[model samples]
Target: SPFPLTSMDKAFITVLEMTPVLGTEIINYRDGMGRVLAQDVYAKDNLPPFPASVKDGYAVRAADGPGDRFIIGESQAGEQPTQTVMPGQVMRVTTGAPIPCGADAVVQVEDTELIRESDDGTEELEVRILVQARPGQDIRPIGHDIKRGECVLAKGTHMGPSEIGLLATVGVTEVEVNKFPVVAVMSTGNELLNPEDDLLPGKIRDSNRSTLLATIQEHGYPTINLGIVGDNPDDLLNALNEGISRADVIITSGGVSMGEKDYLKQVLDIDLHAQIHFGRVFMKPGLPTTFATLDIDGVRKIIFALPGNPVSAVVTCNLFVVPALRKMQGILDPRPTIIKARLSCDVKLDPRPEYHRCILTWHHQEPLPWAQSTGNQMSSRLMSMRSANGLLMLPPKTEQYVELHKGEVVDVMVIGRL
Candidate 1:
């Protein structure tokens, strides 16, 4: 309850000092979204094995594109054209279709007038070419995107939608990616009830658990909901034991402060023999946040005891758990992206380094997006997170540190996108 407060930087360093417990696993690239690539992904074949048409048009030699050309046959995607385009002959081509042999360029259907068409439009009869075609025009050459044996992604790359597409283009059906560490989440308190239950005389709906769970889930980690454990130390110990056995990391909300019933920090440090890295943090909204490590059956399990307030839970989760999750997945730079933004209005500095939730808006007239505080920032006021897209990292209270002005630039940790 009276633990020494640690600097934000030191606490962060403590969390990262622990080694990632999860290892690598091979999985289909389709299921690799949000996972980190553990190995270099090499291209097995050229992106386009042959010259391919980029538009639905005519594939022909550059010299034959200046005038009406005789239609020979069609080349649809996935079919090898048997007919080749001779000097004055053109082959009907569709987008992504392989260009017929002897064709050096492709004229888009928009550039050529359709002189005639077969019934049902199954065949191109003839087309009048209006413009001169350049050599290899509108045709994607072999290996244009990726060459065989070239590394498409280096190790430690976070696989997003676009990254997954690159793996598919390189003919990689399966990839070796860093395994996601499963997390065990639990809320401690009898005053908290499930959302389905009616509010009792003194009970409130549990928002911290669901909010923290969704926050973790949104980042792609597998979660084990340990549900609720009351203030009893035995229940807390039992819940923690079960959590350590079932998950690679444990996250508990509430019961970490100086309250008489608070038993999380005590149970973890005494009953579970966990090493409490820090029980206090020198910051706003989450000053009582605690981080600890336990060795369960020879496996290290990290425990993050976040504050009970709704907004505090969300903010601390992003500041701590988000990076830890990314680090376990082999990301080289796991920290949240911090960008420079100017204050939209006057902002006062705090006594301790504060992560002030903010809304970032871009202006066509200005060079940078202005960040404005999200109304009232009371830790219990969940509405503070409503439109917040970034955090203004304000410095601690000091003689030199004064209120920030509207046009002054500040470092903002991006938490959302506008």
Candidate 2:
């Protein structure tokens, strides 16, 4: 039998106590999106190693007379000018073309007119002295955007499109990124059947398994679905041993609660030599949560046994598993981006601190909240989870307020809800 439970904070602390011992691997840049970086990436070379034109123009000396007609020598991308521009002379330039030597300014082509084309295919041009050209107008100096050998991107940056562009700009063909942690998710219960199987009375489809799989996948981690394990200790032990043998983390739902036939705790204690730190938390809809760790085959594996209810399973996974996955991936700040929002309607808070499923929307320069449950906030209700954008973080000690004012800011989790 399990001992009495403690506060929700204690439970969370204990759950996080299982330090994540994870490793990293380098993958192709294509496979690195949303993955954490394992090492710092320094710029191998300065971007645009030469003074280049930002637009199609004529490179010339700023001190030269605007009325002075000059014969265009040469200038284009890839091919350098055969002769440098002298005083009173200019070079025809195009966008991204390098500015030839002895030139200080780029006059936009629109500001000049091609007088005539010489027999050698060169064209003489003239510009009006309407405005004085600055010393370095329309020219992007070398190393202006990114300096050479600078620490362009630090480690642990979640790879995105902009990051990819930065790496390519610095000539980084390959990168070192953190490896995805392998997590094994199992849903156990005699009344549960595979989602592909036909339904029967008193039998519920394995929705939690798919839900958990999608949740873990969204975090950019690999998940192993061990399928549905029956209530038998032997079957559970076999599946657990197999999962522990391969996975860095183990998760199961529907067996750790205090039901007459719930044998997950019993089997974990007897067969796996596991320590059940807590059997419950002081939160609604997810009170029957369990955290444990077991040493299997000379390796330690962290196990999370969640409730059978779909919403409870998801809540427990987000609160606990998401953080663990982030740590394993070498993330220092793994918590969700919490923002302040106002409640849109009157609502009652539970006596214990709990994450309520609700839809959060940006309304009138504030966050508006609507409880997912119109009547019941039960854990088994999957509809609430589907219809919600984020969890409305209602403090445990909140009281009923009229209209719930629009200016009130509250914490909003922006993961699955977004």
Candidate 3:
């Protein structure tokens, strides 16, 4: 009995019931960007594993400075040092070169002058140290950056480029990471046509399918174009059956309403034997949104029956689908990043909770990004979503229309780059 529209929070909770997409897969460290770490990554060896020089200079005992020192030998990167410096002696060492066994400090070339040369003067065999050196100056000790067996990355860490770089530094050649959930996109309606198809007078382009596909891919999920389905129960059922067998989640636009031709809900309910987790939500522009789950051969798949209008589909996907995708990927805090911003214009609230799309701008006078609405927000106005980076959650309009003042601070869901 899905009569009363479910609240937004309850719908979010229902989506959390989705379990992780299953076991982990081992992948090369180079191919691990954007995946969640399934295992704790430990350091195989200490970063800069040896006591190394941090500057191109001479390694000498810190106390043996402020005098002429003989350069016994030179140490460069990649080669080990065989000679150890005795008292009043130094060894020329390049940056990252292992420090000699007896040296305790590194004196930069700026603080030392080549006072003596080889008999042929081809090289400076001896150097005069001018600055007083201290113990362990400009020298990195073993395990300074990272210690052996240290947990460099915890389980459930989202592997961004930065994380990959750190793993490489720790000598991780392969990693066990969660597989990205595959998303499927489709548009349902007889009035829709492919963008490339010549438009009949009454037909409209199927922008939702392409946009949904691009949007899902924009967040790094793989998407399958399920193509268009006309207002036919058999066609809809075939689409659902194919998707349930293949995709982790199937997204459909334009067939979950109260219209006579709307057949997605019926097919999901009777044909697929899917449980309609929710049939409605208490949100504007997407009140007819539906979410259902089906267990096909023990593997559960989600179907998002989005509204026919283009704007509603985009808004609801960001609010709900993205969170579910993040949860599947092991992100602890998967919700959209919400922040507060000052309203730049007087906005009258609506009867239902509104996810008003707007641009976020910071102009010195405002404490946060000033939210300016993108004109009239009709559900069919696809252009309203063009450059929107945030959503201003407006409260429901009361019996007496409630409105926020121009400078009122409001909570906004940050959806794009600030």
Model 2, position 300, has a per-residue lDDT of 64
lDDT of 2 by residue, 295-383 (tens): 65665678888889887888778888888787777777776666666655566566777675566555465335433322234542544
Residues 104-134, model 3: lDDT tens digits = 9999999889998989988878899989988
Clash totals, every prediction: 0, 2, 1
Of the candidates shown, which would achieve the greatest lDDT relative to the real structure? 1
Candidate 1 lDDT, tens digit per residue, 174-208? 88888888988999887889888999989988888
Where in model 1 is the C-alpha error above 4 Å?
Answer: 19-21, 63-68, 109-132, 198-204, 256-262, 375-386
lDDT of 3 at 350: 75
Candidate with top TM-score is 3
Give each model's whole-structure lDDT.
0.84, 0.76, 0.83
Ranked candidates, highest TM-score first: 3, 2, 1
* Of 2 and 3, the candidate ranking higher by lDDT: 3
How high is the lDDT of residue 180 in model 1? 89
- Residue pairs of candidate 3 with colliding backbone atoms: 350-397
User: Which pairs clash (backbone N, Cα, C closer than 3 Å) in model 1?
Assistant: none
